[PDB]
A paper describes a structure:
Multiple strategies have been developed to modify monoclonal antibodies, including chemical conjugation and protein engineering. Recently, we identified a cyclic, 12-amino-acid peptide that binds in a cavity formed by all four IgG domains of the cetuximab Fab. Owing to the location of the binding site within the Fab, we have termed the peptide a meditope (medi-, middle, + -tope, place). Based on our observations, the peptide–Fab interaction does not affect antigen binding. Herein, multiple crystal structures of meditope peptide derivatives incorporating natural and unnatural amino acids bound to the cetuximab Fab domain are presented.
Next, we turned our attention to leucine at position 5 in the meditope peptide. The hydroxyl group forms a weak hydrogen bond to the hydroxyl group of Tyr182 HC (3.6/3.8 Å). In addition, it was observed that substitution of Leu5 by tyrosine and glutamate strongly reduced the affinity, whereas the substitution of Leu5 by diphenyl­alanine moderately reduced the half-life (by approximately fivefold).
Numbering used by the authors:
A (entry chain E): 1 to 12
B (entry chain A): 1 to 213
C (entry chain B): 1 to 133, 138 to 220
């Protein structure tokens, strides 16, 4: 997974 | 630097189940591990310090254990508010480093979406662009299809979707699909429709409007 | 009440420098070190450095050359500066405080500062109503369109309306500008009684817009 700085959540 | 490997990458559980996060260090680090929770749009939140020691204000269902290279964060009964990412951190060895994280997803019963369609506002049409919005509200699971049709012509490539993270209360998702046209094209057509397909619907559901009314 | 409040999000040009201020309260900078952590797509959570109680600094090895941390004890402010930013330096930057004055157990965090490294220009958003047109429940919202960079905050009725609110993640359009929608479901019988306003704040452009949403 990769961190998404728009939601501050891991986006996989 | 110490490499921290968190497994699994994604954890999917049901409410009430026990759940365990794993953090494996590239070499022995004693008990010098800290755990963090990150909710949607939040900053990291300290859950456990030094493998197992408690943190003020953290619910008692959170606990930790392990020593050496293998560490475990546990939730004895996960709640819908536990939906988040979880990170470990080692500080036995400068510099302090963080694992890549484990995402916690929550299963629940199938919930069909509620569908709404929004024509472009008269204010936006002054700018020469038309945004048509189709809303799929409070559904589960995440998979869903939105098919746009303008005067029965299938639209393709001129829409974009955005999906919320799992709601902390009911564990559902919500989805927005935005169809973007030029004002000239929008004024050339009448029937605007989004068709929603989802497991919770026995048939596809279509919300539509006629430009004007 | 220990708290850390950071300066607002902003855009930084490639090869330019980043500046962030962390104003602390509930404790004195003379008794606690303040750490700096960032969170990027490329490398996740990453510890950058720290300024200790007495003023000494430590910088993580890959930032020894372009990092600089200072503070003003009397004004309770910690100043973070990083030089020569590139695209992959785009991340959320936090200040943090440990549980004890010497440790790394980050119990208190700033709210974060989304730093975007891009050559583009700052642009405020336009806000368009999603006017309500099932089962007594009406849906309405706001279209927050054509802004850069992230983020934008949306509340409803100045924070008094939170139930049923969904603010969708921003999506990047082909123009290089972001767009998002924020919706809320309400009883349809309250549309003629209650006023519904979405409060849009794009701090990078200092754009603050309240949009009343009515049935058309
Ligand atoms: C940014 O790119 C440089 C150049 O390869 C790399 O050394 C650094 O780790 C990168 N930082 C990230 C991906 O956060």
């Amino acid at each position: 997974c990769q961190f998404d700085y728009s939601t501050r959540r891991l986006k996989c | 630097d110490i490499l921290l490997t968190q497994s699994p990458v994604i954890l999917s559980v049901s409410p009430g189940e026990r759940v365990s996060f794993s953090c494996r260090a590239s070499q022995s680090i004693g008990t010098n591990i800290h755990w963090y929770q990150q909710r949607t749009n939040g900053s990291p939140r300290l859950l456990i310090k030094y493998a197992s020691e408690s943190i003020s204000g953290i619910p008692s269902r959170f606990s930790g254990s392990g020593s050496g290279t293998d560490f475990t964060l546990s939730i004895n009964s996960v709640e819908s508010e536990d939906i988040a990412d979880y990170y470990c951190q080692q500080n036995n060895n400068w510099p302090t480093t963080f694992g890549a994280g484990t995402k916690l997803e929550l299963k629940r019963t199938v919930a069909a979406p509620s569908v709404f369609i929004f024509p472009p506002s008269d204010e936006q049409l002054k700018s020469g662009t038309a945004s048509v919005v189709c809303l799929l509200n409070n559904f589960y699971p995440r998979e869903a299809k939105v098919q746009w049709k303008v005067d029965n012509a299938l639209q393709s490539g001129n829409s974009q979707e955005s999906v919320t993270e799992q709601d902390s209360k009911d564990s559902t998702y919500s989805l927005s699909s935005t169809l973007t046209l030029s004002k000239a094209d929008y004024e050339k057509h009448k029937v605007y429709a989004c068709e929603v397909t989802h497991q919770g619907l026995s048939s596809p559901v279509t919300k539509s409007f006629n430009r004007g009314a | 009440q220990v708290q850390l409040k950071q300066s607002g999000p902003g855009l930084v040009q490639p090869s330019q420098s980043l500046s962030i201020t962390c104003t602390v309260s509930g404790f004195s900078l003379t008794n606690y070190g303040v750490h700096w952590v960032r969170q990027s797509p490329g490398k996740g959570l990453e510890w950058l450095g720290v300024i200790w109680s007495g003023g000494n600094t430590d910088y993580n090895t890959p930032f020894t050359s372009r990092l600089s941390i200072n503070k003003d004890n009397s004004k309770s402010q910690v100043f973070f500066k990083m030089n020569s930013l590139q695209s992959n330096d785009t991340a959320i930057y936090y200040c943090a405080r440990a549980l004890t004055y010497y440790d790394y157990e980050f119990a208190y965090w700033g709210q974060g500062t989304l730093v975007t490294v891009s050559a583009a220009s700052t642009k405020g958003p336009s806000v368009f109503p999603l006017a309500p047109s099932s089962g007594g429940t009406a849906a309405l919202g706001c279209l927050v369109k054509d802004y850069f960079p992230e983020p934008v905050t949306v509340s409803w009725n100045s924070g008094a309306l939170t139930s049923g609110v969904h603010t969708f993640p921003a999506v990047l359009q082909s123009s290089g500008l972001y767009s998002l929608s924020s919706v809320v479901t309400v009883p349809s019988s309250s549309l003629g009684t209650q006023t519904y306003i979405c409060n849009v704040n794009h701090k990078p452009s200092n754009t603050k817009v309240d949009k009343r949403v009515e049935p058309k």
